[PDB]
Design an enzyme around this catalytic site. Structure first.
Site, PDB file in Angstrom:
ATOM      1  N   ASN A  16      11.186  67.778  73.196  1.00 19.86           N
ATOM      2  CA  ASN A  16      10.410  67.210  72.086  1.00 19.86           C
ATOM      3  C   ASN A  16       9.126  66.584  72.575  1.00 19.86           C
ATOM      4  OD1 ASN A  16      12.476  67.526  69.794  1.00 19.86           O
ATOM      5  ND2 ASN A  16      13.597  66.286  71.247  1.00 19.86           N
ATOM      6  N   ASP A  60      14.408  70.794  67.611  1.00 22.03           N
ATOM      7  CA  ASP A  60      15.239  71.188  66.458  1.00 22.03           C
ATOM      8  C   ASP A  60      15.867  72.584  66.638  1.00 22.03           C
ATOM      9  OD1 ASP A  60      14.463  68.744  65.291  1.00 22.03           O
ATOM     10  OD2 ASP A  60      13.537  69.649  63.499  1.00 22.03           O
ATOM     11  N   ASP A 100      26.784  64.695  75.573  1.00 23.71           N
ATOM     12  CA  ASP A 100      25.372  64.319  75.656  1.00 23.71           C
ATOM     13  C   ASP A 100      24.554  65.485  76.215  1.00 23.71           C
ATOM     14  OD1 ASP A 100      23.160  62.568  75.417  1.00 23.71           O
ATOM     15  OD2 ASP A 100      23.429  61.768  77.432  1.00 23.71           O
ATOM     16  N   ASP A 116      20.894  63.898  69.788  1.00 26.73           N
ATOM     17  CA  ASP A 116      21.250  64.913  70.769  1.00 26.73           C
ATOM     18  C   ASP A 116      22.679  64.681  71.321  1.00 26.73           C
ATOM     19  OD1 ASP A 116      20.086  62.452  72.000  1.00 26.73           O
ATOM     20  OD2 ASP A 116      20.397  63.531  73.895  1.00 26.73           O
TER      21      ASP A 116
END
Ligand SMILES: Nc1nc2c(ncn2[C@@H]2O[C@@H]3COP(=O)(O)O[C@H]4[C@@H](O)[C@H](n5cnc6c(=O)[nH]c(N)nc65)O[C@@H]4COP(=O)(O)O[C@H]3[C@H]2O)c(=O)[nH]1
Ligand SMILES: Nc1nc2c(ncn2[C@@H]2O[C@@H]3COP(=O)(O)O[C@H]4[C@@H](O)[C@H](n5cnc6c(=O)[nH]c(N)nc65)O[C@@H]4COP(=O)(O)O[C@H]3[C@H]2O)c(=O)[nH]1
Ligand SMILES: Nc1nc2c(ncn2[C@@H]2O[C@@H]3COP(=O)(O)O[C@H]4[C@@H](O)[C@H](n5cnc6c(=O)[nH]c(N)nc65)O[C@@H]4COP(=O)(O)O[C@H]3[C@H]2O)c(=O)[nH]1
Ligand SMILES: Nc1nc2c(ncn2[C@@H]2O[C@@H]3COP(=O)(O)O[C@H]4[C@@H](O)[C@H](n5cnc6c(=O)[nH]c(N)nc65)O[C@@H]4COP(=O)(O)O[C@H]3[C@H]2O)c(=O)[nH]1
Lengths: 162, 162
Positions: free
Chosen positions: B48, B57, B40, B83
């Site tokens: 973002n 990205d 993770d 993610d």
């Protein structure tokens, strides 16, 4: 994603290439041999032309299931074309090539019950070895394809020589 | 077929399950261990939300490429979620676990430069072992997911205990 052919239930052509190139990368890391078989079923065109595409399909389902049953779950059995099958045997040994071919030849040769009839296909097998015949799946498949065609020509059930 | 995530270029979730269950079948045949890591990346939501999906990205592309060069081509690195990354390490050894984790932790931790801003993600890794933690991929992933969340909850950037 990782698609299967819905009729036979076997991995399809695209999954065979992806999975196949992964097995060759792993075998390079492990020092293990990989054999690539190219299987053509001869009397297939005759089945569909005489009985129809539906009868040909039942011959494939049955022949696909039988072949799966006779090779390790860790090996790859794929439907390459309409009646062409490709097999990837991980950690295979040259000495027992002939013995493993007679196991696969005897399976494919078994007659299939179709609308009361017992229909039969005749196999021709081309054999390619990793690392002797190539570095990637593409090269091994072209060699196994070529040898499968030499086998059909010599009217022998298999061809594996360099 | 066998799909890849177009942005990261890594195998996607569905290909990871198919390929993963194939590696476990092979390892059962070969007597080899397989470790399943669940990674993770924290800080991702913050990237973002502050800079936009395009900056997030670029953090993924770069972090995906970096991880891909630090593990064997024969190992599977997949984009599991937005993610979340899952790693399948074939023929892994319990003793070298800690050392391999520090290699992957140091990679993920590397900052990604995008429009000057130093953008960093923080990893938390859950580790599951085959055959100790399960028989199939599904079971190993639930255990590594569970342990990744225990690691997150703690000071340590990885959790691997039974
Ligand atoms: N002559 C020969 N035949 C082979 C060989 N490898 C596979 N087969 C054939 O392929 C069938 C399916 O193998 P599987 O899925 O690996 O599934 C196998 C495998 O998981 C396990 N097993 C049996 N023997 C061995 C073994 O010697 N080593 C390992 N690792 N597993 C074995 O039990 C399952 C059932 O085996 P079978 O009913 O015998 O059915 C086997 C057998 O007919 C082989 O090296 N030599
Ligand atoms: N990839 C692949 N390779 C195959 C297959 N069948 C045979 N081979 C190769 O040929 C070697 C010897 O086969 P064998 O004479 O049947 O000698 C076999 C056979 O006597 C027995 N055996 C192994 N697996 C099975 C099995 O799954 N079922 C049964 N019934 N016997 C098995 O143990 C022996 C040694 O096994 P290995 O060390 O693996 O060594 C095997 C393996 O490298 C196959 O279906 N797929
Ligand atoms: N400390 C450590 N690092 C590991 C280990 N396995 C993989 N790596 C890392 O993952 C990178 C890519 O490995 P690869 O794709 O197998 O690709 C490898 C592989 O094809 C070959 N190679 C290098 N060493 C070995 C080896 O000891 N055995 C085998 N079979 N191949 C090796 O060279 C290629 C490039 O390797 P590198 O530039 O070193 O870069 C390696 C290395 O940073 C490991 O067991 N221990
Ligand atoms: N799936 C997977 N497993 C990994 C990886 N890295 C380490 N392992 C596992 O942990 C063992 C010891 O790693 P090491 O101390 O770096 O010790 C390694 C390392 O020093 C060297 N070596 C192996 N591969 C590479 C490599 O690709 N590049 C470089 N530079 N060295 C390598 O050979 C030693 C022993 O090799 P192994 O028998 O492979 O034994 C490896 C392998 O079982 C990995 O990236 N992926």
């Amino acid at each position: 994603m990782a698609y299967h052919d819905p009729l036979t239930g076997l991995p399809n052509r695209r999954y065979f290439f992806e999975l196949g190139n992964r097995y060759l990368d792993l075998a390079k890391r492990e020092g293990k041999k990989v054999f690539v078989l190219f299987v053509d079923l001869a009397g297939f065109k005759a089945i569909n032309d005489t009985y129809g595409h539906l009868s040909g399909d039942e011959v494939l389902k049955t022949v696909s299931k039988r072949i799966l049953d006779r090779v390790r779950r860790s090996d790859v059995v794929a439907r390459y074309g309409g009646d062409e099958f490709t097999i990837l045997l991980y950690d295979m040994k040259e000495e027992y090539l002939k013995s493993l071919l007679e196991r696969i030849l005897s399976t494919f040769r078994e007659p299939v019950r179709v609308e009361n009839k017992h229909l039969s296909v005749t196999p021709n097998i081309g054999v390619a070895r990793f690392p002797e015949d190539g570095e990637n799946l593409e090269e091994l498949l072209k060699v196994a394809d070529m040898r499968m065609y030499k086998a059909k020509e010599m009217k022998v059930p298999y061809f594996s020589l360099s």
